[PDB]
Structure formats: C-alpha cells, structure tokens
PDB file of C-alpha atoms and ligand atoms in Angstrom:
ATOM      1  CA  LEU A1242     -44.520 160.258 242.240  1.00  0.00           C
ATOM      2  CA  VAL A1243     -41.658 157.578 242.080  1.00  0.00           C
ATOM      3  CA  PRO A1244     -41.588 155.499 238.352  1.00  0.00           C
ATOM      4  CA  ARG A1245     -40.636 152.174 239.237  1.00  0.00           C
ATOM      5  CA  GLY A1246     -37.863 152.127 236.869  1.00  0.00           C
ATOM      6  CA  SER A1247     -36.022 154.768 238.635  1.00  0.00           C
ATOM      7  CA  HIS A1248     -33.768 154.282 241.774  1.00  0.00           C
ATOM      8  CA  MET A1249     -34.748 157.185 244.371  1.00  0.00           C
ATOM      9  CA  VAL A1250     -32.717 157.182 247.523  1.00  0.00           C
ATOM     10  CA  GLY A1251     -34.046 158.841 250.783  1.00  0.00           C
ATOM     11  CA  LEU A1252     -32.380 159.589 254.055  1.00  0.00           C
ATOM     12  CA  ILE A1253     -34.422 159.812 257.362  1.00  0.00           C
ATOM     13  CA  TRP A1254     -32.987 160.565 261.088  1.00  0.00           C
ATOM     14  CA  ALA A1255     -33.948 162.256 264.288  1.00  0.00           C
ATOM     15  CA  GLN A1256     -31.263 164.455 265.793  1.00  0.00           C
ATOM     16  CA  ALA A1257     -30.784 166.417 268.834  1.00  0.00           C
ATOM     17  CA  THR A1258     -30.230 170.378 267.768  1.00  0.00           C
ATOM     18  CA  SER A1259     -26.727 169.764 268.249  1.00  0.00           C
ATOM     19  CA  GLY A1260     -26.603 167.089 265.193  1.00  0.00           C
ATOM     20  CA  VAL A1261     -26.522 164.080 267.719  1.00  0.00           C
ATOM     21  CA  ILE A1262     -28.140 160.981 266.510  1.00  0.00           C
ATOM     22  CA  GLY A1263     -26.752 158.480 268.426  1.00  0.00           C
ATOM     23  CA  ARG A1264     -24.609 157.831 271.818  1.00  0.00           C
ATOM     24  CA  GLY A1265     -23.439 154.499 273.226  1.00  0.00           C
ATOM     25  CA  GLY A1266     -25.301 152.315 270.829  1.00  0.00           C
ATOM     26  CA  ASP A1267     -28.604 153.639 271.178  1.00  0.00           C
ATOM     27  CA  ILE A1268     -30.598 157.086 270.619  1.00  0.00           C
ATOM     28  CA  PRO A1269     -30.017 159.117 273.771  1.00  0.00           C
ATOM     29  CA  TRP A1270     -33.844 160.195 273.626  1.00  0.00           C
ATOM     30  CA  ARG A1271     -37.192 158.794 272.966  1.00  0.00           C
ATOM     31  CA  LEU A1272     -40.012 160.708 271.036  1.00  0.00           C
ATOM     32  CA  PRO A1273     -43.325 158.858 270.182  1.00  0.00           C
ATOM     33  CA  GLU A1274     -44.337 161.470 267.743  1.00  0.00           C
ATOM     34  CA  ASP A1275     -40.839 160.861 265.931  1.00  0.00           C
ATOM     35  CA  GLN A1276     -41.504 156.959 265.877  1.00  0.00           C
ATOM     36  CA  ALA A1277     -44.573 157.526 263.995  1.00  0.00           C
ATOM     37  CA  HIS A1278     -43.119 159.786 261.803  1.00  0.00           C
ATOM     38  CA  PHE A1279     -40.586 156.995 261.036  1.00  0.00           C
ATOM     39  CA  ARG A1280     -42.979 154.686 260.469  1.00  0.00           C
ATOM     40  CA  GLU A1281     -45.552 156.807 258.261  1.00  0.00           C
ATOM     41  CA  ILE A1282     -42.519 157.336 255.625  1.00  0.00           C
ATOM     42  CA  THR A1283     -40.842 154.313 255.454  1.00  0.00           C
ATOM     43  CA  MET A1284     -43.597 151.512 255.751  1.00  0.00           C
ATOM     44  CA  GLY A1285     -44.175 149.428 252.540  1.00  0.00           C
ATOM     45  CA  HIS A1286     -40.458 150.482 251.169  1.00  0.00           C
ATOM     46  CA  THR A1287     -36.987 149.051 251.733  1.00  0.00           C
ATOM     47  CA  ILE A1288     -34.942 150.258 254.551  1.00  0.00           C
ATOM     48  CA  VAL A1289     -30.901 150.040 254.734  1.00  0.00           C
ATOM     49  CA  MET A1290     -29.316 150.566 257.736  1.00  0.00           C
ATOM     50  CA  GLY A1291     -25.816 149.970 258.973  1.00  0.00           C
ATOM     51  CA  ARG A1292     -24.631 146.956 261.140  1.00  0.00           C
ATOM     52  CA  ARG A1293     -24.521 148.819 264.148  1.00  0.00           C
ATOM     53  CA  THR A1294     -28.252 150.224 263.410  1.00  0.00           C
ATOM     54  CA  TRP A1295     -29.169 146.966 263.178  1.00  0.00           C
ATOM     55  CA  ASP A1296     -27.308 145.703 266.383  1.00  0.00           C
ATOM     56  CA  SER A1297     -29.076 148.622 268.162  1.00  0.00           C
ATOM     57  CA  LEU A1298     -32.016 147.288 267.725  1.00  0.00           C
ATOM     58  CA  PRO A1299     -33.730 144.501 270.421  1.00  0.00           C
ATOM     59  CA  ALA A1300     -33.567 140.941 268.640  1.00  0.00           C
ATOM     60  CA  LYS A1301     -37.238 140.680 269.250  1.00  0.00           C
ATOM     61  CA  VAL A1302     -38.151 143.886 266.921  1.00  0.00           C
ATOM     62  CA  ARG A1303     -36.033 143.375 263.952  1.00  0.00           C
ATOM     63  CA  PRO A1304     -36.587 142.934 261.009  1.00  0.00           C
ATOM     64  CA  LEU A1305     -38.828 146.004 261.444  1.00  0.00           C
ATOM     65  CA  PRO A1306     -41.908 144.741 260.031  1.00  0.00           C
ATOM     66  CA  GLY A1307     -43.618 146.207 256.956  1.00  0.00           C
ATOM     67  CA  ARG A1308     -40.229 146.915 255.151  1.00  0.00           C
ATOM     68  CA  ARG A1309     -37.670 145.246 253.622  1.00  0.00           C
ATOM     69  CA  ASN A1310     -34.644 145.041 255.511  1.00  0.00           C
ATOM     70  CA  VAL A1311     -31.151 145.526 254.318  1.00  0.00           C
ATOM     71  CA  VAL A1312     -28.311 145.702 256.669  1.00  0.00           C
ATOM     72  CA  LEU A1313     -24.539 147.276 255.344  1.00  0.00           C
ATOM     73  CA  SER A1314     -21.672 145.164 256.619  1.00  0.00           C
ATOM     74  CA  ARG A1315     -17.981 144.645 255.449  1.00  0.00           C
ATOM     75  CA  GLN A1316     -17.802 141.497 257.496  1.00  0.00           C
ATOM     76  CA  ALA A1317     -18.399 138.279 255.784  1.00  0.00           C
ATOM     77  CA  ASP A1318     -19.702 136.406 258.608  1.00  0.00           C
ATOM     78  CA  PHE A1319     -22.162 138.666 259.986  1.00  0.00           C
ATOM     79  CA  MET A1320     -25.843 137.583 259.458  1.00  0.00           C
ATOM     80  CA  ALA A1321     -29.009 139.532 259.944  1.00  0.00           C
ATOM     81  CA  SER A1322     -31.810 136.858 260.707  1.00  0.00           C
ATOM     82  CA  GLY A1323     -34.866 138.076 258.835  1.00  0.00           C
ATOM     83  CA  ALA A1324     -33.024 140.482 256.460  1.00  0.00           C
ATOM     84  CA  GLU A1325     -30.312 140.707 254.018  1.00  0.00           C
ATOM     85  CA  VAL A1326     -26.799 141.543 254.421  1.00  0.00           C
ATOM     86  CA  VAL A1327     -25.002 143.064 251.499  1.00  0.00           C
ATOM     87  CA  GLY A1328     -21.213 144.970 251.176  1.00  0.00           C
ATOM     88  CA  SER A1329     -22.303 148.170 249.691  1.00  0.00           C
ATOM     89  CA  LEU A1330     -24.882 150.462 248.823  1.00  0.00           C
ATOM     90  CA  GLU A1331     -24.563 149.400 245.364  1.00  0.00           C
ATOM     91  CA  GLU A1332     -26.306 146.067 246.214  1.00  0.00           C
ATOM     92  CA  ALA A1333     -28.616 148.000 248.602  1.00  0.00           C
ATOM     93  CA  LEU A1334     -30.262 150.449 246.463  1.00  0.00           C
ATOM     94  CA  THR A1335     -31.778 147.957 243.895  1.00  0.00           C
ATOM     95  CA  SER A1336     -35.552 148.921 244.785  1.00  0.00           C
ATOM     96  CA  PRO A1337     -37.329 151.798 243.354  1.00  0.00           C
ATOM     97  CA  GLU A1338     -37.669 153.751 246.589  1.00  0.00           C
ATOM     98  CA  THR A1339     -35.253 153.303 249.511  1.00  0.00           C
ATOM     99  CA  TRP A1340     -35.167 154.949 252.627  1.00  0.00           C
ATOM    100  CA  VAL A1341     -31.695 154.865 254.636  1.00  0.00           C
ATOM    101  CA  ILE A1342     -32.440 154.604 258.075  1.00  0.00           C
ATOM    102  CA  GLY A1343     -28.948 155.120 259.500  1.00  0.00           C
ATOM    103  CA  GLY A1344     -26.687 155.494 261.519  1.00  0.00           C
ATOM    104  CA  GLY A1345     -23.977 158.469 261.290  1.00  0.00           C
ATOM    105  CA  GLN A1346     -21.390 156.343 259.219  1.00  0.00           C
ATOM    106  CA  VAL A1347     -24.324 155.087 256.366  1.00  0.00           C
ATOM    107  CA  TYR A1348     -25.946 158.522 256.129  1.00  0.00           C
ATOM    108  CA  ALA A1349     -22.506 159.961 255.057  1.00  0.00           C
ATOM    109  CA  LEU A1350     -22.135 157.222 252.702  1.00  0.00           C
ATOM    110  CA  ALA A1351     -25.607 157.382 251.101  1.00  0.00           C
ATOM    111  CA  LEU A1352     -25.697 161.357 250.766  1.00  0.00           C
ATOM    112  CA  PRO A1353     -23.821 161.119 247.011  1.00  0.00           C
ATOM    113  CA  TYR A1354     -26.969 159.162 245.870  1.00  0.00           C
ATOM    114  CA  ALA A1355     -29.882 160.672 247.947  1.00  0.00           C
ATOM    115  CA  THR A1356     -32.705 163.224 246.378  1.00  0.00           C
ATOM    116  CA  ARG A1357     -34.528 163.704 249.562  1.00  0.00           C
ATOM    117  CA  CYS A1358     -34.031 163.954 253.630  1.00  0.00           C
ATOM    118  CA  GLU A1359     -36.401 163.564 255.967  1.00  0.00           C
ATOM    119  CA  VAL A1360     -35.430 164.800 259.493  1.00  0.00           C
ATOM    120  CA  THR A1361     -37.003 165.261 262.796  1.00  0.00           C
ATOM    121  CA  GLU A1362     -34.920 167.674 265.009  1.00  0.00           C
ATOM    122  CA  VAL A1363     -35.933 167.411 269.177  1.00  0.00           C
ATOM    123  CA  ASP A1364     -35.352 170.456 271.195  1.00  0.00           C
ATOM    124  CA  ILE A1365     -32.993 168.815 273.573  1.00  0.00           C
ATOM    125  CA  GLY A1366     -29.614 169.853 274.654  1.00  0.00           C
ATOM    126  CA  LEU A1367     -27.509 167.049 274.320  1.00  0.00           C
ATOM    127  CA  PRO A1368     -24.163 168.440 273.270  1.00  0.00           C
ATOM    128  CA  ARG A1369     -21.555 166.427 271.017  1.00  0.00           C
ATOM    129  CA  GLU A1370     -19.370 163.872 273.070  1.00  0.00           C
ATOM    130  CA  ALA A1371     -16.504 161.714 271.468  1.00  0.00           C
ATOM    131  CA  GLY A1372     -18.026 159.023 269.989  1.00  0.00           C
ATOM    132  CA  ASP A1373     -21.201 160.188 269.080  1.00  0.00           C
ATOM    133  CA  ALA A1374     -23.199 159.296 265.668  1.00  0.00           C
ATOM    134  CA  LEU A1375     -24.005 162.684 263.917  1.00  0.00           C
ATOM    135  CA  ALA A1376     -26.178 163.376 261.383  1.00  0.00           C
ATOM    136  CA  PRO A1377     -24.813 164.109 257.991  1.00  0.00           C
ATOM    137  CA  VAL A1378     -24.067 167.755 257.134  1.00  0.00           C
ATOM    138  CA  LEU A1379     -26.062 169.155 254.121  1.00  0.00           C
ATOM    139  CA  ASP A1380     -24.510 171.794 251.710  1.00  0.00           C
ATOM    140  CA  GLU A1381     -26.134 174.073 249.462  1.00  0.00           C
ATOM    141  CA  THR A1382     -27.504 171.749 246.935  1.00  0.00           C
ATOM    142  CA  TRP A1383     -29.808 170.854 249.212  1.00  0.00           C
ATOM    143  CA  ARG A1384     -33.115 173.015 249.590  1.00  0.00           C
ATOM    144  CA  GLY A1385     -34.794 172.752 252.772  1.00  0.00           C
ATOM    145  CA  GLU A1386     -38.361 172.895 254.402  1.00  0.00           C
ATOM    146  CA  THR A1387     -38.161 173.615 258.297  1.00  0.00           C
ATOM    147  CA  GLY A1388     -41.478 172.968 260.213  1.00  0.00           C
ATOM    148  CA  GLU A1389     -42.245 175.430 263.219  1.00  0.00           C
ATOM    149  CA  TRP A1390     -41.757 174.116 266.488  1.00  0.00           C
ATOM    150  CA  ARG A1391     -44.111 171.546 267.778  1.00  0.00           C
ATOM    151  CA  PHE A1392     -44.676 170.240 271.197  1.00  0.00           C
ATOM    152  CA  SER A1393     -44.649 166.438 271.921  1.00  0.00           C
ATOM    153  CA  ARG A1394     -46.815 164.727 274.643  1.00  0.00           C
ATOM    154  CA  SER A1395     -43.686 163.679 276.294  1.00  0.00           C
ATOM    155  CA  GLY A1396     -42.972 167.511 276.819  1.00  0.00           C
ATOM    156  CA  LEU A1397     -40.196 168.021 274.085  1.00  0.00           C
ATOM    157  CA  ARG A1398     -40.235 170.329 271.412  1.00  0.00           C
ATOM    158  CA  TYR A1399     -39.723 169.172 267.993  1.00  0.00           C
ATOM    159  CA  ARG A1400     -39.613 170.176 264.525  1.00  0.00           C
ATOM    160  CA  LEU A1401     -39.558 168.274 261.018  1.00  0.00           C
ATOM    161  CA  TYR A1402     -37.083 169.128 258.064  1.00  0.00           C
ATOM    162  CA  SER A1403     -37.799 167.997 254.566  1.00  0.00           C
ATOM    163  CA  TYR A1404     -34.936 168.677 252.107  1.00  0.00           C
ATOM    164  CA  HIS A1405     -34.643 167.901 248.362  1.00  0.00           C
ATOM    165  CA  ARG A1406     -32.577 168.255 245.590  1.00  0.00           C
ATOM    166  CA  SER A1407     -32.129 167.146 241.758  1.00  0.00           C
TER     167      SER A1407
HETATM  168  N1  LIG B1609     -31.240 159.427 265.560  1.00  0.00           N
HETATM  169  C1  LIG B1609     -31.623 158.607 264.446  1.00  0.00           C
HETATM  170  O1  LIG B1609     -32.186 158.755 263.492  1.00  0.00           O
HETATM  171  C2  LIG B1609     -30.705 157.004 264.449  1.00  0.00           C
HETATM  172  C3  LIG B1609     -30.907 156.361 263.328  1.00  0.00           C
HETATM  173  C4  LIG B1609     -30.212 155.217 263.076  1.00  0.00           C
HETATM  174  C5  LIG B1609     -29.439 155.112 264.240  1.00  0.00           C
HETATM  175  N2  LIG B1609     -28.794 155.623 264.981  1.00  0.00           N
HETATM  176  C6  LIG B1609     -27.592 155.586 266.137  1.00  0.00           C
HETATM  177  O2  LIG B1609     -26.501 155.921 265.366  1.00  0.00           O
HETATM  178  C7  LIG B1609     -25.601 155.019 266.061  1.00  0.00           C
HETATM  179  C8  LIG B1609     -25.270 154.014 264.946  1.00  0.00           C
HETATM  180  O3  LIG B1609     -24.316 154.711 263.866  1.00  0.00           O
HETATM  181  P1  LIG B1609     -23.055 154.021 263.426  1.00  0.00           P
HETATM  182  O4  LIG B1609     -22.512 155.591 262.474  1.00  0.00           O
HETATM  183  O5  LIG B1609     -22.204 154.057 264.633  1.00  0.00           O
HETATM  184  O6  LIG B1609     -23.048 153.104 262.834  1.00  0.00           O
HETATM  185  P2  LIG B1609     -24.208 152.268 261.521  1.00  0.00           P
HETATM  186  O7  LIG B1609     -23.791 153.421 260.308  1.00  0.00           O
HETATM  187  O8  LIG B1609     -25.324 152.257 261.612  1.00  0.00           O
HETATM  188  O9  LIG B1609     -23.210 151.206 261.127  1.00  0.00           O
HETATM  189  C9  LIG B1609     -21.660 151.348 260.975  1.00  0.00           C
HETATM  190  C10 LIG B1609     -21.572 149.857 260.248  1.00  0.00           C
HETATM  191  O10 LIG B1609     -22.004 149.846 258.953  1.00  0.00           O
HETATM  192  C11 LIG B1609     -21.017 149.243 258.014  1.00  0.00           C
HETATM  193  N3  LIG B1609     -20.624 149.807 256.743  1.00  0.00           N
HETATM  194  C12 LIG B1609     -20.225 151.232 257.210  1.00  0.00           C
HETATM  195  N4  LIG B1609     -19.854 151.668 255.777  1.00  0.00           N
HETATM  196  C13 LIG B1609     -20.217 150.447 254.940  1.00  0.00           C
HETATM  197  C14 LIG B1609     -19.727 150.837 253.318  1.00  0.00           C
HETATM  198  N5  LIG B1609     -18.916 151.286 252.599  1.00  0.00           N
HETATM  199  N6  LIG B1609     -19.998 149.178 252.995  1.00  0.00           N
HETATM  200  C15 LIG B1609     -20.557 148.244 253.940  1.00  0.00           C
HETATM  201  N7  LIG B1609     -21.030 148.579 254.968  1.00  0.00           N
HETATM  202  C16 LIG B1609     -20.414 149.687 255.669  1.00  0.00           C
HETATM  203  C17 LIG B1609     -20.125 148.505 258.788  1.00  0.00           C
HETATM  204  O11 LIG B1609     -20.464 146.955 259.502  1.00  0.00           O
HETATM  205  P3  LIG B1609     -18.865 146.034 259.885  1.00  0.00           P
HETATM  206  O12 LIG B1609     -18.395 146.849 260.667  1.00  0.00           O
HETATM  207  O13 LIG B1609     -19.969 144.859 259.901  1.00  0.00           O
HETATM  208  O14 LIG B1609     -18.540 145.950 258.562  1.00  0.00           O
HETATM  209  C18 LIG B1609     -19.985 149.715 260.150  1.00  0.00           C
HETATM  210  O15 LIG B1609     -19.369 149.318 261.116  1.00  0.00           O
HETATM  211  C19 LIG B1609     -26.133 154.095 267.266  1.00  0.00           C
HETATM  212  O16 LIG B1609     -25.813 154.747 268.506  1.00  0.00           O
HETATM  213  C20 LIG B1609     -28.076 153.979 266.662  1.00  0.00           C
HETATM  214  O17 LIG B1609     -28.424 154.132 267.885  1.00  0.00           O
HETATM  215  C21 LIG B1609     -29.932 156.833 265.226  1.00  0.00           C
HETATM  216  C1  LIG B1610     -37.531 155.909 265.586  1.00  0.00           C
HETATM  217  C2  LIG B1610     -35.989 156.401 265.577  1.00  0.00           C
HETATM  218  C3  LIG B1610     -35.705 156.985 264.047  1.00  0.00           C
HETATM  219  N1  LIG B1610     -36.329 157.906 263.880  1.00  0.00           N
HETATM  220  C4  LIG B1610     -36.412 158.722 262.528  1.00  0.00           C
HETATM  221  N2  LIG B1610     -36.606 159.501 262.036  1.00  0.00           N
HETATM  222  N3  LIG B1610     -35.526 158.242 261.682  1.00  0.00           N
HETATM  223  C5  LIG B1610     -34.513 157.180 261.953  1.00  0.00           C
HETATM  224  N4  LIG B1610     -33.798 156.768 260.753  1.00  0.00           N
HETATM  225  C6  LIG B1610     -34.770 156.269 263.272  1.00  0.00           C
HETATM  226  O1  LIG B1610     -34.032 155.455 263.175  1.00  0.00           O
HETATM  227  C7  LIG B1610     -34.701 153.825 262.892  1.00  0.00           C
HETATM  228  C8  LIG B1610     -33.697 152.832 262.870  1.00  0.00           C
HETATM  229  C9  LIG B1610     -33.460 152.768 264.994  1.00  0.00           C
HETATM  230  O2  LIG B1610     -34.718 152.751 265.228  1.00  0.00           O
HETATM  231  C10 LIG B1610     -34.961 152.637 266.729  1.00  0.00           C
HETATM  232  N5  LIG B1610     -33.559 152.920 267.528  1.00  0.00           N
HETATM  233  C11 LIG B1610     -33.855 153.158 268.653  1.00  0.00           C
HETATM  234  C12 LIG B1610     -34.812 153.339 269.567  1.00  0.00           C
HETATM  235  C13 LIG B1610     -36.086 152.808 268.738  1.00  0.00           C
HETATM  236  C14 LIG B1610     -35.877 152.748 267.179  1.00  0.00           C
HETATM  237  C15 LIG B1610     -37.235 152.313 266.316  1.00  0.00           C
HETATM  238  C16 LIG B1610     -37.431 151.113 265.823  1.00  0.00           C
HETATM  239  C17 LIG B1610     -37.456 150.113 266.961  1.00  0.00           C
HETATM  240  O3  LIG B1610     -38.878 149.960 267.340  1.00  0.00           O
HETATM  241 CL1  LIG B1611     -40.343 151.196 263.312  1.00  0.00          CL
END
C-alpha cells in the first residue's frame, strides 16, 4: 500500500529486447496489450514525462486522460496545454504515487528516486541505432520478476517484468 504522506516513484516503459524504447520521435512498434497494461498501471495517478515524450503524443490525445500530466522541460517558454510544465524532478514528484512514463532521458534522471519499475518487453528484433532512446539499465540493487513469454493478438511475443527495491 502507498501511505498518503509518502512519495512513491515508479517507472513504466516498453522496450524491444535490445533495450530500444524510442526512435525518430515515436515508439517503433505498436502493441495493444502494452497500451492496455500502461493504462491499468497509471490510471488515477500523476504521470511525469519528458518534453520530447509530450511532443510525441498527438495533440488530440494529450494530456492523457484520467491522470495528472506533468511535463519536464528546461525551456522557460515551453508550454503544454492541459498539463503542468516543471523544470525539475523535485517539482514533478509531489504526489503520493507518481509514474514516470518516459522517455530515455527522464527515466535515467528519475531512477535514483524510484522503487518500482514495470516493464513490457516486446520480442521484436530492433537493434540499437544512433539517436535511439533506450531503457534505463538496472543495477544489482533491483530485484525483478520476469513473466513468461506471452503472445499478442498482433503476432508479437511479449513479456512483463516487475522490478523493486527499497
Ligand atoms: N517505449 C516507451 O515506453 C516510451 C515511453 C515514452 C517515450 N518513448 C519514446 O522515447 C523518445 C523520447 O525520449 P527522449 O529520451 O528523447 O526524451 P524525453 O526523456 O521524453 O524528454 C527529454 C526532454 O526532457 C527535458 N528534461 C530532461 N532532463 C531534464 C531535467 N533534468 N530537468 C528538466 N527537464 C529535463 C528536456 O526538455 P527541454 O529540451 O524542453 O529542456 C529534454 O529535452 C521518443 O521516441 C518517444 O516516443 C518511449
Ligand atoms: C503505451 C506506450 C507505453 N507503454 C508503456 N508500457 N510504458 C510507457 N511509458 C509507454 O509510453 C507512454 C507515453 C507514450 O505513449 C505513446 N507513445 C506512442 C504511441 C502511443 C502512446 C500511448 C499514449 C497515446 O495514446
Ligand atoms: Cl494512455
């Protein structure tokens, strides 16, 4: 359970087996099971994203509904209609439960404060290319639960990981 006076920080992302999470300002696959899972985890909570992740969402769908949207930017004139723009993680992480929803820069930034990661791994062969956004690497202070491989309606294998630390 999450006490209302704490500040729990989780990370949630979907990656190829190579660790790629983003390419060319988008996610280089689509997996309905993953979007359903992302909604199930994050709904009702604050979500924190980097400015480039906000940019990657079509204007008509953002801010993502059912969640307090917070965007990280260092640009004093960047504005996110419907959402709050802050310049640091300290400003972004004031809710009792916060999910950092990407992208590569902000995962790495937020990991020192996080105690949970929820990962979808997609069994698509997407090798790392220069410029890609990548999943954060987790050191030995993390302990993980790896699900068995499942099969999506769209014909891709995928599996879920849950990582925790104190
Ligand atoms: N597969 C997934 O789970 C997943 C999830 C989310 C996103 N993505 C993909 O990942 C890519 C985006 O990731 P990215 O690494 O390029 O960018 P990002 O992490 O989404 O955003 C980077 C931006 O965040 C701001 N920022 C970074 N560090 C900051 C700090 N310390 N304080 C304040 N603001 C800070 C800066 O905005 P300013 O430049 O405005 O200062 C920076 O340009 C896209 O391809 C997207 O589609 C994938
Ligand atoms: C669903 C992708 C995802 N999956 C996991 N597991 N964790 C994340 N943090 C994550 O990204 C959430 C922010 C990027 O959302 C998208 N980006 C590109 C296309 C579609 C979407 C879905 C919102 C628009 O309907
Ligand atoms: Cl969503």
